[PDB]
Symmetry: C3
Subunit: 131 residues, 3 copies
Protein backbone atom coordinates (compact mmCIF):
# COMPACT_ATOMS: atom_id res chain seq x y z
CA UNK A 1 0.00 0.00 0.00
CA UNK A 2 0.88 3.73 -0.70
CA UNK A 3 0.50 4.91 2.94
CA UNK A 4 2.62 1.93 4.09
CA UNK A 5 5.50 2.51 1.58
CA UNK A 6 5.52 6.23 2.54
CA UNK A 7 5.83 5.49 6.29
CA UNK A 8 8.54 2.89 5.54
CA UNK A 9 10.51 5.55 3.65
CA UNK A 10 10.07 8.08 6.48
CA UNK A 11 11.43 5.36 8.89
CA UNK A 12 14.45 4.81 6.59
CA UNK A 13 15.11 8.59 6.81
CA UNK A 14 14.66 8.74 10.59
CA UNK A 15 17.01 5.79 11.12
CA UNK A 16 19.61 7.71 9.06
CA UNK A 17 19.17 10.84 11.18
CA UNK A 18 19.52 8.73 14.38
CA UNK A 19 22.79 7.24 13.03
CA UNK A 20 24.11 10.80 12.29
CA UNK A 21 23.29 11.68 15.90
CA UNK A 22 24.96 8.46 17.22
CA UNK A 23 28.11 9.32 15.15
CA UNK A 24 28.19 12.82 16.63
CA UNK A 25 27.82 11.58 20.18
CA UNK A 26 30.57 8.97 19.64
CA UNK A 27 32.95 11.74 18.56
CA UNK A 28 32.04 13.89 21.60
CA UNK A 29 32.74 10.89 23.85
CA UNK A 30 36.07 10.05 22.20
CA UNK A 31 37.22 13.62 22.63
CA UNK A 32 36.15 13.70 26.25
CA UNK A 33 37.98 10.39 27.00
CA UNK A 34 41.13 11.89 25.48
CA UNK A 35 40.72 15.16 27.49
CA UNK A 36 40.36 13.27 30.79
CA UNK A 37 43.76 11.57 30.04
CA UNK A 38 45.26 15.04 29.75
CA UNK A 39 43.60 16.11 33.03
CA UNK A 40 45.11 13.04 34.71
CA UNK A 41 48.54 14.08 33.35
CA UNK A 42 47.93 17.73 34.64
CA UNK A 43 47.25 16.13 38.10
CA UNK A 44 50.55 14.21 37.79
CA UNK A 45 52.42 17.43 37.00
CA UNK A 46 50.89 19.10 40.10
CA UNK A 47 51.66 16.05 42.25
CA UNK A 48 55.33 16.49 41.08
CA UNK A 49 55.32 20.14 42.19
CA UNK A 50 53.91 19.31 45.62
CA UNK A 51 56.54 16.52 46.15
CA UNK A 52 59.31 19.11 45.52
CA UNK A 53 57.76 21.70 47.83
CA UNK A 54 57.19 19.14 50.62
CA UNK A 55 60.85 18.04 50.27
CA UNK A 56 62.02 21.66 50.64
CA UNK A 57 59.76 22.21 53.73
CA UNK A 58 61.19 19.06 55.39
CA UNK A 59 64.77 20.26 54.68
CA UNK A 60 63.88 23.67 56.21
CA UNK A 61 62.32 21.93 59.24
CA UNK A 62 65.65 20.14 59.85
CA UNK A 63 67.60 23.39 59.50
CA UNK A 64 65.29 25.16 61.96
CA UNK A 65 65.77 22.33 64.50
CA UNK A 66 69.55 22.56 64.14
CA UNK A 67 69.43 26.34 64.56
CA UNK A 68 67.19 26.13 67.64
CA UNK A 69 69.87 23.88 69.20
CA UNK A 70 72.78 26.10 68.11
CA UNK A 71 71.02 29.13 69.63
CA UNK A 72 70.63 27.21 72.92
CA UNK A 73 74.41 26.35 72.87
CA UNK A 74 75.37 30.00 72.23
CA UNK A 75 73.07 31.01 75.08
CA UNK A 76 74.84 28.63 77.47
CA UNK A 77 78.19 30.16 76.45
CA UNK A 78 77.12 33.78 76.90
CA UNK A 79 75.39 32.81 80.20
CA UNK A 80 78.75 31.52 81.37
CA UNK A 81 80.86 34.48 80.10
CA UNK A 82 78.76 37.24 81.71
CA UNK A 83 79.51 36.41 85.42
CA UNK A 84 83.18 36.01 84.52
CA UNK A 85 83.24 39.59 83.18
CA UNK A 86 81.28 40.77 86.29
CA UNK A 87 83.99 39.09 88.46
CA UNK A 88 86.81 40.77 86.50
CA UNK A 89 85.08 44.14 87.02
CA UNK A 90 85.05 43.40 90.78
CA UNK A 91 88.69 42.25 90.90
CA UNK A 92 89.84 45.30 88.89
CA UNK A 93 87.83 47.66 91.18
CA UNK A 94 89.59 45.92 94.14
CA UNK A 95 93.02 46.25 92.61
CA UNK A 96 92.53 49.88 91.61
CA UNK A 97 91.67 50.87 95.16
CA UNK A 98 94.56 48.86 96.61
CA UNK A 99 96.97 50.40 94.05
CA UNK A 100 95.84 53.95 94.95
CA UNK A 101 96.25 53.11 98.68
CA UNK A 102 99.79 51.74 97.98
CA UNK A 103 100.72 54.89 96.05
CA UNK A 104 99.59 57.03 99.08
CA UNK A 105 101.42 54.79 101.53
CA UNK A 106 104.63 54.77 99.53
CA UNK A 107 104.38 58.58 99.29
CA UNK A 108 104.00 58.84 103.07
CA UNK A 109 106.95 56.46 103.62
CA UNK A 110 109.11 58.47 101.17
CA UNK A 111 108.42 61.73 103.08
CA UNK A 112 108.98 60.01 106.47
CA UNK A 113 112.32 58.56 105.23
CA UNK A 114 113.40 62.05 104.13
CA UNK A 115 112.47 63.47 107.53
CA UNK A 116 114.53 60.76 109.34
CA UNK A 117 117.47 61.37 106.96
CA UNK A 118 117.35 65.10 107.85
CA UNK A 119 116.95 64.21 111.60
CA UNK A 120 120.11 62.02 111.57
CA UNK A 121 122.01 64.96 110.02
CA UNK A 122 120.57 67.43 112.57
CA UNK A 123 121.45 65.28 115.56
CA UNK A 124 124.89 64.13 114.37
CA UNK A 125 125.81 67.77 113.52
CA UNK A 126 124.65 68.84 117.01
CA UNK A 127 126.57 66.08 118.85
CA UNK A 128 129.76 66.70 116.79
CA UNK A 129 129.56 70.39 117.74
CA UNK A 130 129.44 69.49 121.48
CA UNK A 131 132.62 67.35 121.19
CA UNK B 1 -0.19 -6.47 4.09
CA UNK B 2 -1.61 -6.69 7.69
CA UNK B 3 1.58 -7.99 9.34
CA UNK B 4 3.56 -5.36 7.45
CA UNK B 5 1.41 -2.50 8.70
CA UNK B 6 1.79 -3.64 12.32
CA UNK B 7 5.59 -3.98 12.10
CA UNK B 8 5.89 -0.54 10.47
CA UNK B 9 4.20 1.01 13.57
CA UNK B 10 6.45 -0.99 15.93
CA UNK B 11 9.37 0.57 13.95
CA UNK B 12 7.91 4.07 14.30
CA UNK B 13 7.76 3.53 18.05
CA UNK B 14 11.24 1.99 18.29
CA UNK B 15 12.82 4.81 16.28
CA UNK B 16 11.21 7.41 18.57
CA UNK B 17 12.39 5.46 21.67
CA UNK B 18 15.98 5.34 20.26
CA UNK B 19 15.84 9.13 19.67
CA UNK B 20 14.63 9.80 23.23
CA UNK B 21 17.45 7.62 24.58
CA UNK B 22 20.05 9.36 22.33
CA UNK B 23 18.81 12.76 23.71
CA UNK B 24 19.21 11.47 27.28
CA UNK B 25 22.77 10.30 26.52
CA UNK B 26 23.53 13.73 25.02
CA UNK B 27 22.43 15.39 28.30
CA UNK B 28 24.67 12.96 30.32
CA UNK B 29 27.58 13.96 28.06
CA UNK B 30 26.76 17.69 28.55
CA UNK B 31 26.85 17.11 32.31
CA UNK B 32 30.26 15.42 32.04
CA UNK B 33 31.55 18.40 29.97
CA UNK B 34 30.30 20.68 32.84
CA UNK B 35 32.09 18.46 35.42
CA UNK B 36 35.29 18.78 33.26
CA UNK B 37 35.04 22.55 33.22
CA UNK B 38 34.74 22.61 37.00
CA UNK B 39 37.76 20.33 37.39
CA UNK B 40 39.82 22.58 35.10
CA UNK B 41 38.77 25.65 37.12
CA UNK B 42 39.81 23.88 40.40
CA UNK B 43 43.21 23.08 38.89
CA UNK B 44 43.60 26.71 37.79
CA UNK B 45 42.78 27.91 41.33
CA UNK B 46 45.42 25.43 42.65
CA UNK B 47 48.05 26.86 40.26
CA UNK B 48 47.22 30.31 41.59
CA UNK B 49 47.40 29.06 45.22
CA UNK B 50 50.86 27.64 44.43
CA UNK B 51 52.18 31.12 43.50
CA UNK B 52 51.47 32.18 47.14
CA UNK B 53 52.74 28.97 48.71
CA UNK B 54 55.98 29.00 46.66
CA UNK B 55 56.50 32.66 47.65
CA UNK B 56 55.92 31.84 51.35
CA UNK B 57 58.30 28.82 51.28
CA UNK B 58 61.00 30.93 49.64
CA UNK B 59 60.53 33.73 52.20
CA UNK B 60 60.86 31.11 54.99
CA UNK B 61 63.95 29.65 53.39
CA UNK B 62 65.59 33.05 53.16
CA UNK B 63 64.73 33.88 56.82
CA UNK B 64 66.30 30.55 57.91
CA UNK B 65 69.43 31.28 55.77
CA UNK B 66 69.78 34.73 57.40
CA UNK B 67 69.44 33.18 60.84
CA UNK B 68 72.05 30.50 60.06
CA UNK B 69 74.44 33.29 59.08
CA UNK B 70 73.60 35.30 62.25
CA UNK B 71 74.30 32.22 64.38
CA UNK B 72 77.63 31.76 62.69
CA UNK B 73 78.60 35.40 63.26
CA UNK B 74 77.54 35.28 66.92
CA UNK B 75 79.48 32.04 67.40
CA UNK B 76 82.59 33.71 65.95
CA UNK B 77 82.14 36.64 68.34
CA UNK B 78 81.76 34.39 71.39
CA UNK B 79 84.81 32.32 70.18
CA UNK B 80 86.79 35.56 70.18
CA UNK B 81 85.55 36.83 73.61
CA UNK B 82 86.22 33.63 75.55
CA UNK B 83 90.05 33.59 75.30
CA UNK B 84 90.15 37.32 76.05
CA UNK B 85 88.34 36.64 79.34
CA UNK B 86 90.68 33.65 80.06
CA UNK B 87 93.60 36.06 79.51
CA UNK B 88 92.14 38.71 81.82
CA UNK B 89 91.65 36.07 84.52
CA UNK B 90 95.36 35.29 84.27
CA UNK B 91 96.45 38.94 84.10
CA UNK B 92 94.36 39.87 87.16
CA UNK B 93 95.43 36.79 89.16
CA UNK B 94 99.10 37.65 88.62
CA UNK B 95 98.45 41.36 89.42
CA UNK B 96 96.70 40.35 92.65
CA UNK B 97 99.77 38.49 93.83
CA UNK B 98 102.03 41.44 92.95
CA UNK B 99 99.70 43.85 94.84
CA UNK B 100 99.68 41.57 97.96
CA UNK B 101 103.49 41.37 97.81
CA UNK B 102 103.72 45.16 97.60
CA UNK B 103 101.36 45.56 100.59
CA UNK B 104 103.55 43.15 102.66
CA UNK B 105 106.72 44.95 101.52
CA UNK B 106 105.44 48.42 102.29
CA UNK B 107 104.25 47.19 105.72
CA UNK B 108 107.72 45.79 106.41
CA UNK B 109 109.42 49.05 105.27
CA UNK B 110 107.06 51.07 107.56
CA UNK B 111 107.95 48.93 110.58
CA UNK B 112 111.65 48.93 109.75
CA UNK B 113 111.59 52.78 109.50
CA UNK B 114 109.79 52.87 112.97
CA UNK B 115 112.61 50.67 114.40
CA UNK B 116 115.28 53.01 113.00
CA UNK B 117 113.39 56.08 114.31
CA UNK B 118 113.46 54.72 117.87
CA UNK B 119 117.06 53.56 117.51
CA UNK B 120 118.07 57.15 116.58
CA UNK B 121 116.25 58.54 119.66
CA UNK B 122 117.87 55.93 121.96
CA UNK B 123 121.38 56.43 120.57
CA UNK B 124 121.22 60.26 120.58
CA UNK B 125 119.93 60.24 124.19
CA UNK B 126 122.83 57.88 125.11
CA UNK B 127 125.52 60.01 123.39
CA UNK B 128 124.15 63.27 124.81
CA UNK B 129 124.48 61.75 128.29
CA UNK B 130 128.17 60.89 127.70
CA UNK B 131 129.04 64.48 126.66
CA UNK C 1 7.64 -8.18 -1.49
CA UNK C 2 10.01 -5.14 -1.70
CA UNK C 3 8.11 -3.49 1.17
CA UNK C 4 8.32 -6.58 3.41
CA UNK C 5 12.12 -6.74 2.82
CA UNK C 6 12.64 -3.02 3.60
CA UNK C 7 10.64 -3.27 6.79
CA UNK C 8 12.88 -6.18 8.02
CA UNK C 9 16.01 -4.14 6.98
CA UNK C 10 14.60 -1.32 9.18
CA UNK C 11 14.12 -3.79 12.05
CA UNK C 12 17.78 -4.85 11.56
CA UNK C 13 19.05 -1.24 11.43
CA UNK C 14 17.10 -0.25 14.55
CA UNK C 15 18.58 -3.23 16.40
CA UNK C 16 22.13 -2.23 15.31
CA UNK C 17 21.54 1.37 16.43
CA UNK C 18 20.35 0.04 19.84
CA UNK C 19 23.56 -2.04 20.25
CA UNK C 20 25.54 1.15 19.59
CA UNK C 21 23.36 3.16 22.03
CA UNK C 22 23.85 0.53 24.75
CA UNK C 23 27.62 0.60 24.14
CA UNK C 24 27.75 4.39 24.30
CA UNK C 25 25.72 4.31 27.57
CA UNK C 26 28.34 1.99 29.11
CA UNK C 27 31.21 4.22 27.83
CA UNK C 28 29.51 7.22 29.49
CA UNK C 29 29.13 5.27 32.77
CA UNK C 30 32.84 4.49 32.66
CA UNK C 31 33.72 8.16 32.00
CA UNK C 32 31.49 9.17 34.96
CA UNK C 33 33.59 6.81 37.14
CA UNK C 34 36.80 8.41 35.85
CA UNK C 35 35.38 11.88 36.75
CA UNK C 36 34.47 10.75 40.28
CA UNK C 37 38.03 9.50 40.81
CA UNK C 38 39.48 12.80 39.49
CA UNK C 39 37.24 14.76 41.85
CA UNK C 40 38.50 12.59 44.76
CA UNK C 41 42.15 13.29 43.68
CA UNK C 42 41.39 17.04 43.58
CA UNK C 43 40.03 16.86 47.12
CA UNK C 44 43.22 15.16 48.27
CA UNK C 45 45.36 17.74 46.38
CA UNK C 46 43.40 20.62 47.97
CA UNK C 47 44.18 19.19 51.40
CA UNK C 48 47.84 18.53 50.48
CA UNK C 49 48.14 22.31 49.73
CA UNK C 50 46.38 23.16 53.05
CA UNK C 51 48.81 20.72 54.81
CA UNK C 52 51.87 22.41 53.27
CA UNK C 53 50.62 25.92 54.16
CA UNK C 54 49.84 24.71 57.76
CA UNK C 55 53.37 23.36 58.15
CA UNK C 56 54.96 26.52 56.68
CA UNK C 57 52.95 28.76 59.04
CA UNK C 58 54.00 26.59 62.05
CA UNK C 59 57.63 26.66 60.94
CA UNK C 60 57.43 30.46 60.40
CA UNK C 61 56.39 30.82 64.04
CA UNK C 62 59.36 28.64 65.21
CA UNK C 63 61.67 30.76 62.96
CA UNK C 64 60.23 33.96 64.51
CA UNK C 65 61.10 32.68 67.99
CA UNK C 66 64.66 31.93 66.79
CA UNK C 67 65.02 35.35 65.14
CA UNK C 68 63.98 36.83 68.55
CA UNK C 69 66.49 34.67 70.43
CA UNK C 70 69.23 35.70 68.02
CA UNK C 71 68.43 39.37 68.57
CA UNK C 72 68.61 38.82 72.37
CA UNK C 73 71.98 37.02 72.12
CA UNK C 74 73.26 39.82 69.84
CA UNK C 75 72.30 42.44 72.43
CA UNK C 76 74.20 40.47 75.11
CA UNK C 77 77.39 40.05 73.05
CA UNK C 78 77.21 43.74 71.94
CA UNK C 79 77.18 44.65 75.65
CA UNK C 80 79.95 42.20 76.75
CA UNK C 81 82.52 43.17 74.10
CA UNK C 82 83.14 46.81 75.21
CA UNK C 83 83.31 45.63 78.85
CA UNK C 84 86.17 43.27 77.89
CA UNK C 85 87.84 46.03 75.82
CA UNK C 86 87.64 48.28 78.93
CA UNK C 87 89.17 45.59 81.20
CA UNK C 88 92.09 45.22 78.75
CA UNK C 89 92.76 48.96 78.96
CA UNK C 90 92.28 49.29 82.72
CA UNK C 91 94.51 46.27 83.49
CA UNK C 92 97.21 47.63 81.20
CA UNK C 93 97.18 50.90 83.25
CA UNK C 94 97.18 48.99 86.51
CA UNK C 95 100.18 46.88 85.37
CA UNK C 96 102.20 50.05 84.69
CA UNK C 97 101.29 51.50 88.10
CA UNK C 98 102.29 48.17 89.80
CA UNK C 99 105.68 48.11 88.03
CA UNK C 100 106.31 51.72 89.11
CA UNK C 101 105.40 50.82 92.73
CA UNK C 102 107.79 47.86 92.65
CA UNK C 103 110.68 50.04 91.45
CA UNK C 104 109.85 52.73 94.05
CA UNK C 105 109.60 50.28 96.94
CA UNK C 106 112.88 48.62 95.83
CA UNK C 107 114.60 52.02 95.84
CA UNK C 108 113.19 52.97 99.28
CA UNK C 109 114.34 49.54 100.59
CA UNK C 110 117.93 50.19 99.51
CA UNK C 111 117.78 53.79 100.82
CA UNK C 112 116.52 52.66 104.23
CA UNK C 113 119.34 50.06 104.44
CA UNK C 114 121.86 52.82 103.63
CA UNK C 115 120.43 55.08 106.37
CA UNK C 116 120.57 52.15 108.87
CA UNK C 117 124.30 51.69 107.97
CA UNK C 118 124.86 55.51 108.22
CA UNK C 119 123.37 55.58 111.78
CA UNK C 120 125.76 52.73 112.76
CA UNK C 121 128.79 54.48 111.08
CA UNK C 122 128.00 57.82 112.74
CA UNK C 123 127.22 56.45 116.24
CA UNK C 124 130.53 54.45 116.14
CA UNK C 125 132.36 57.65 115.07
CA UNK C 126 130.76 59.85 117.81
CA UNK C 127 131.35 57.20 120.51
CA UNK C 128 135.05 57.15 119.40
CA UNK C 129 135.34 60.91 119.92
CA UNK C 130 133.72 60.87 123.42
CA UNK C 131 134.71 57.70 125.30
CL1 LIG D 1 68.70 18.24 54.90
CL1 LIG E 1 46.62 26.70 50.70
CL1 LIG F 1 51.66 29.19 52.76
CL1 LIG G 1 133.20 64.89 125.11
Amino acid sequence: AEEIKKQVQVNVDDIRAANIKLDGLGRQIADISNSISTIESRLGEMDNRLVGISSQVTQLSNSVSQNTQSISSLGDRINAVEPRVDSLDTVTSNLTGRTSTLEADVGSLRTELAALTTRVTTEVTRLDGLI
